[model samples]
Target: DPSDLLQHVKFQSSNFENILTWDSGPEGTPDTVYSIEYKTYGERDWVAKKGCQRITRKSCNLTVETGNLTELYYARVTAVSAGGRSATKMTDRFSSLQHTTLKPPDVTCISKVRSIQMIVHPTPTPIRARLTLEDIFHDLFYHLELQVQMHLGGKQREYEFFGLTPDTEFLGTIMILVPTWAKESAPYMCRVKTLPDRTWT
Candidate 1:
């Protein structure tokens, strides 16, 4: 008649990740069969029953575990005697799980391209250009890693001076750099050094 009293058994969850637990069956009770079940939030179906019994206390554990952040569930315990008697108990539900939740790069343009020329007022006048440059100009402090490329009409060319035929106009573009601080947009600047159309004997 004392088999229905669930007994003086001490048990708790094991492996016990954030959502797992085990049960240690009662001592000196070889035939004290143990069964467990749980119910979760927003669910009408109860989890399937589980069971275990060994010389150790944590013989019974909740396998097939899950971690639904917003879901809550409670476990229930039951015991059966060698004579087929049954007793059950359930624990309060708890919730302590969470889900994991990140940005893009910024870009800007600095300057435009310009061309310079020298020699030959006739055909294939050797030319030069800035090709490309940054917007590192700051009114007065705008110059870093300056680059001056030479071009010949359509293809890249070379030139030593820009004032050979005094009557011809030689033009050159200044390419500035875009500072890193101007995160709002790309900035650019240009400069042109001219040669007089007259030469001395």
Candidate 2:
């Protein structure tokens, strides 16, 4: 009986880039190679992940296989070496919509005499072309941070900051806030200088 050389097998995802990884157990051999298979939650058959069969790498990219953000998935790995084949190690069910971390929003800024306007481009969903973060998270929020001030709002891509000091440089970062899941995206930095105050002489 071979030992369970593939241990701690699991999935990690960010921005819909799903990857399955595993660690070699205590009795692992240096010449061990691995094969991976995955399936949707209710599927009767497991599909062998291409480009990952009999490979020496400890991780496999499953972004294409797990593209449905709302669907649940499972992945497993088996290790083989001169000693023999180890028992198959499986992962817990994972959902891209719930488990994946979000990427930062793309922000652009325009400065006015006493205000700044920010335009945020929607973050794209990886491996799912033509889909966006907003398409899945209807109630998405944007959190803006500038100096000691903060602003939070819902679904609006364009925001203006009023009552700002003219002629001063302002640096800020913005993040996506998924209220339902309480998840936040990585911060995106923006910098702008407000125009000089208009002369009234």
Candidate 3:
């Protein structure tokens, strides 16, 4: 019997790129193939996921199938071999909006006479159309690490940090935040010596 051929079936998502993954049991053979199907939680019918039917790989990209972030989804996979077809393994209720992991955004900083201008480049998504991290996380926030740490609310992309020491070098990092999640990018080291201090004659 092929009942135990499929194990550890579940969904893994990162930045809305939802993927279905499974592990083959120790007793599984190389000839075994898998079929995947998915549907909304409350729906009665299971639709076959394109590009995944009778595939030998152990993972399937379900990003398009579960594109509706607000909708709950369920996915199942079955193993087929010369022996027979294994019992279908289904995943628990999943919500992309709540479960997807957020990637860190790229940060650029330029120093002026007395301040630094910071720009945040939104992370790209795997969707067919041009979609950004901000589009998915509507309530996204920004956290800046500096001498005086601060948090910026809303979708503003450009920020200016004023009241900084001139002719000095500063190292800072920017982190993207949601209500319950946060991801920090690499540190940006900048020098604020663009012009000589003109405060004194």
Task: Please give the CA lDDT of all the candidate structures.
Answer: 0.35, 0.84, 0.76
For 92-121, candidate 1 gives per-residue lDDT tens digits of 554422110000111121222222332211
Q: Give the per-residue lDDT digits (tens) of candidate 2, residues 1-201.
A: 233476778888888889999988877579888999999998789999889999998999998899976579999898888777566888989888888998888899888998888888987776565678888788888988765385756678888888888999998788899989888998998888999998899
TM-score of each: 0.33, 0.88, 0.77
Total residue pair clashes for candidate 1: 19
Query: Among all windows of ten consecutive residues in candidate 3, which has the lowest summed lDDT?
Result: 185-194
- List the candidates ranked by TM-score, beginning with the highest: 2, 3, 1
| Candidate 3 runs further than 4 Å off | 1-3, 123-132, 147-155, 165-168, 180-201
| Evaluation by TM-score, superior candidate among 1 and 3 | 3
Clashes of 2: 0
